[PDB]
Design a protein around this ligand. Structure first.
Ligand SMILES: COc1ccc([C@H](C)c2cc(-c3cn(C)nc3C)[nH]n2)cc1
Ligand code: NA
Ligand code: NA
Length: 219
């Protein structure tokens, strides 16, 4: 039967233009703001994402929580030739939607979709997906997983000095354990990007946390 995620994809395929990532973003934002609410980063936070991507021009990006592919389209469209997005999506049907979304956008060659749980896939990146270290991580999956997966990324050797973590929804509904950790730790240099959720009429924010390297042992 029909699902909201199938409806988002159908709306894009009807109204956007194939090979035009920007029209795809605009169709999804129009849909989610005019037709039917959906978990969506939205254009305002999307601008912040764009600016981070443009500032750091990452060659290898890991996304946690693709959902329908909005953020994957958002980020992958700004990646250079040879740059890669790896995106993880725990739900098989959403992973399928994300693939079709990216196919329509013409971005399928820049993205690898991994269908599984973050804590299961993250430790396979080095072996199976030929990853050394990540240049950027976008966290937008389950909120209680931001802190443990960040710790996991670190202990797996996937962060290097200068790796940018960018996490959504750290205020609403909030990830206070993640924030307390990264802001307090000398291993992360943190900044906060406030953005309004107009539909909920509440301020939310993204946290940017730049990995500084592991903590030094006592002398
Ligand atoms: C109501 O159930 C859900 C609510 C939101 C989602 C988002 C789209 C999501 C979360 C993840 C995910 C979770 N882990 C531990 N690792 C990964 C990868 N992938 N995508 C999925 C299910
Ligand atoms: Na989000
Ligand atoms: Na810090």
């Amino acid at each position: 039967g029909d699902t909201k995620e199938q409806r988002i994809l159908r709306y894009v395929q009807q109204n956007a233009k194939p090979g035009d990532p920007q029209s795809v973003l605009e169709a999804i934002d129009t849909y989610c703001t005019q037709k039917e609410w959906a978990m969506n980063v939205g254009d305002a936070k999307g601008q912040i994402m764009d600016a981070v991507i443009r500032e750091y021009s990452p060659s290898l990006v890991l996304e946690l929580g693709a959902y329908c592919g909005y953020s994957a389209v958002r980020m992958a469209r700004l990646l250079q030739p040879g740059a890669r997005l790896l995106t993880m999506e725990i739900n098989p049907d959403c992973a399928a939607i994300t693939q079709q979304m990216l196919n329509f956008a013409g971005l399928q060659d820049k993205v690898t979709i991994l269908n599984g749980a973050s804590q299961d896939l993250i430790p396979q990146l080095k072996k199976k997906y030929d990853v050394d270290t990540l240049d950027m991580v976008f966290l937008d999956h389950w909120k209680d997983r931001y802190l443990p997966d960040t710790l996991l990324l670190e202990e797996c050797g996937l962060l290097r000095k200068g790796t940018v973590l960018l996490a959504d929804n750290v205020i609403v509904p909030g990830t206070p354990d993640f924030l307390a950790y990264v802001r307090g730790s000398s291993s992360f240099e943190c900044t906060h990007y406030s953005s309004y959720l107009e539909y909920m009429k509440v301020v939310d924010g993204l946290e940017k946390a730049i990995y500084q390297g592991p903590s030094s042992p006592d002398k």
